[PDB]
Amino acid sequence: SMEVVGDFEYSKRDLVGHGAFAVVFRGRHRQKTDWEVAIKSINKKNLSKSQILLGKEIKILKELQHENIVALYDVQELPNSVFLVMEYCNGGDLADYLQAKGTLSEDTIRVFLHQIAAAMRILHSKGIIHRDLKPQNILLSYANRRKSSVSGIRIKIADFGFARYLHSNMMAADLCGSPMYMAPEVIMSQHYDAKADLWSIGTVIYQCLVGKPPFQANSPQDLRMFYEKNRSLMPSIPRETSPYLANLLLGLLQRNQKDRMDFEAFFSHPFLE
Amino acid sequence: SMEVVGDFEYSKRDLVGHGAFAVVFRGRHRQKTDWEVAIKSINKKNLSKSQILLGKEIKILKELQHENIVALYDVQELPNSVFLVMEYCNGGDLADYLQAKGTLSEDTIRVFLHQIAAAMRILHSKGIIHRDLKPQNILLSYASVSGIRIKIADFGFARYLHSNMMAADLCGSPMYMAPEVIMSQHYDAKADLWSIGTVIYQCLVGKPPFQANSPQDLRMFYEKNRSLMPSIPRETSPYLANLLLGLLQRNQKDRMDFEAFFSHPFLEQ
Ligand SMILES: CN1CCc2cc(Nc3ncc(C4CC4)c(NCCCNC(=O)C4CCC4)n3)ccc2C1
Ligand SMILES: CN1CCc2cc(Nc3ncc(C4CC4)c(NCCCNC(=O)C4CCC4)n3)ccc2C1
Ligand code: NA
Numbered sequence: 001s002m003e004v005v006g007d008f009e010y011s012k013r014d015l016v017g018h019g020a021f022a023v024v025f026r027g028r029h030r031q032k033t034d035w036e037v038a039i040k041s042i043n044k045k046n047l048s049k050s051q052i053l054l055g056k057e058i059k060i061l062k063e064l065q066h067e068n069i070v071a072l073y074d075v076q077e078l079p080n081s082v083f084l085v086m087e088y089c090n091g092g093d094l095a096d097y098l099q100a101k102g103t104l105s106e107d108t109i110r111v112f113l114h115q116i117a118a119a120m121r122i123l124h125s126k127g128i129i130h131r132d133l134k135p136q137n138i139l140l141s142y143a144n145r146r147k148s149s150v151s152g153i154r155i156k157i158a159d160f161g162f163a164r165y166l167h168s169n170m171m172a173a174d175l176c177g178s179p180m181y182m183a184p185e186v187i188m189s190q191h192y193d194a195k196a197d198l199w200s201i202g203t204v205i206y207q208c209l210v211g212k213p214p215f216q217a218n219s220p221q222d223l224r225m226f227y228e229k230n231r232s233l234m235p236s237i238p239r240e241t242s243p244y245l246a247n248l249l250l251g252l253l254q255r256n257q258k259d260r261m262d263f264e265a266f267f268s269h270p271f272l273e
Numbered sequence: 274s275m276e277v278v279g280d281f282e283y284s285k286r287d288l289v290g291h292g293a294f295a296v297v298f299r300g301r302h303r304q305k306t307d308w309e310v311a312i313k314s315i316n317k318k319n320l321s322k323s324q325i326l327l328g329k330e331i332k333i334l335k336e337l338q339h340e341n342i343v344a345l346y347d348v349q350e351l352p353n354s355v356f357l358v359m360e361y362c363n364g365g366d367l368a369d370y371l372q373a374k375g376t377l378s379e380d381t382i383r384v385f386l387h388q389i390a391a392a393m394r395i396l397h398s399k400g401i402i403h404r405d406l407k408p409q410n411i412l413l414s415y416a417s418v419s420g421i422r423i424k425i426a427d428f429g430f431a432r433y434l435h436s437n438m439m440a441a442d443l444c445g446s447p448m449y450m451a452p453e454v455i456m457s458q459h460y461d462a463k464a465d466l467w468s469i470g471t472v473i474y475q476c477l478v479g480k481p482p483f484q485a486n487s488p489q490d491l492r493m494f495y496e497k498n499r500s501l502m503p504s505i506p507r508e509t510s511p512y513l514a515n516l517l518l519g520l521l522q523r524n525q526k527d528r529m530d531f532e533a534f535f536s537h538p539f540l541e542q
Contacts (some may be wrong), residue, residue, distance in 0.1 A: 043475075048332060051400075052440050052441055052443070053327070131451070162440060165324040170489075173488045174488050175293035177292075179491055181472065183404070185464065193451065213448045213449070220445075228456065239493060256452075
């Protein structure tokens with residue numbers, strides 16, 4: 001028995017991901033049954049009862065068409081739910097890949113990072129920050145399942161439910177009428193978390209190289225305590241790390257935004273050249 | 274004649290406010306026609322096509338029961354729309370009051386500000402920042418200053434300070450999130466204190482402390498000037514001057530705290 005979602009369907013057995021307000025299944029087109037898709041169901045009702053915002057995943061994915069970002073094929077709205085029918089990544093996530101491979105060569109890291117960079121370029125041009133990049137939403141796709149070496153891997157960024165537009169506060173002000181009462185830091189907020197994704201990518205590269213994240217703690221509150229109590233974070237970089245990768249990690253893993261590497265510097269960095 | 278919304282109704286002619294994706298009408302209960310309500314329609318379809326986020330006005334107003342925050346009586350959800358049926362403020366907004374009065378005495382400012390502070394106290398307890406406080410959404414309900422109750426409205430731009438931190442907790446891995454995302458609670462935490470600063474200033478002086486041609490011009494101004502001195506009349510009392518200077522600090526870190534605001538000697542008088 002299959003659940004039908006417009007022109008698509010899925011089995012409840014083929015769960016590939018979940019979060020607090022969403023589940024994602026492998027499915028397929030009902031007629032072209034070789035066309036595999038990912039079907040995400042978002043619980044709008046539960047979300048409406050929570051402090052966590054609904055977000056703009058549909059608009060953001062609709063606006064992006066890029067080979068390193070999951071495509072959106074269709075949307076079905078219900079009163080309490082919304083379904084997004086998206087590109088299926090047949091290789092799973094980067095966490096699964098690390099589980100199998102342990103740590104990756106620098107050359108593999110470079111190949112992946114080039115694709116991540118290409119995605120970050122389109123996000124940057126559109127003023128979109130993802131804000132939740134991690135191994136679990138950096139996905140692997142094999143266009144030909146026979147060519148399953150590193151060169152056969154295409155990387156695709158997914159799960160944009162936490163993503164935001166940098167210009168949204170300035171757009172709100174334009175629409176509100178008089179902005180003369182709004183706090184300066186609200187008017188100027190574009191310039192605060194603009195480099196959040198660069199830190200994340202830092203932590204992911206680190207984990208690829210070393211086999212754990214650069215900074216671990218018991219719980220989320222404990223890690224928050226750590227970042228708060230240590231204002232100059234030094235990542236522990238293995239001494240055998242190449243000069244350029246060491247340099248790239250040090251520039252990405254700056255606790256303070258203002259010290260962190262710029263996007264133009266990231267995209268130009270010699271590790272990537 | 275009348276649009277029906279559950280147990281209530283309104284005429285499209287009785288508009289009392291509007292914004293980018295919302296309109297508000299004066300309405301009434303269909304049986305108890307002397308019970309006036311404010312009925313808001315939010316265009317969710319248009320909103321979905323914009324960069325501007327669906328907020329949490331329903332949740333916030335549902336969860337609050339406080340005399341200085343507009344009550345929510347009902348919600349009617351449609352595919353493209355939602356109606357909120359809320360408390361009606363028969364006095365209009367603070368801007369309308371300033372239109373009649375010109376400027377307010379310090380004593381009147383203090384009476385209003387006590388009530389605004391009481392609203393800000395409950396928002397602060399719950400980790401809510403309104404982010405768009407202004408004379409147009411600080412409302413008056415009459416049943417003189419002693420008769421006047423202040424109510425805060427329009428929470429469509431409001432945010433929960435802890436929501437990023439809560440997302441991280443519900444991840445299980447907050448491990449890849451940027452420090453400034455994890456700790457963003459400490460960034461716009463005092464947005465409402467600035468806003469209240471500008472409102473008090475306008476009450477006292479009769480204009481906002483800082484005017485620009487356009488929103489982008491005001492953004493340019495705040496960017497270009499790293500400190501900002503409001504022009505305070507010399508006859509302003511020492512405590513009110515102090516309150517204004519401490520609220521109208523361009524930089525969050527220098528701005529007066531909530532505890533200092535709620536305990537401020539201007540209010541203790
Ligand atoms: C054990 N491994 C877990 C990850 C995974 C993902 C996939 N293929 C996949 N393809 C596409 C997508 C969606 C974005 C378009 C996808 N989504 C699940 C993984 C990414 N996380 C999320 O989407 C969040 C879960 C609530 C949103 N997953 C295939 C196998 C496996 C198995
Ligand atoms: C010139 N006029 C100014 C506005 C006004 C409001 C009211 N009484 C009133 N009572 C309650 C409410 C709140 C619960 C919905 C209300 N709302 C309009 C004023 C506040 N702005 C908004 O709510 C935004 C407009 C898009 C949301 N307005 C009465 C007369 C007048 C006179
Ligand atoms: Na309530």
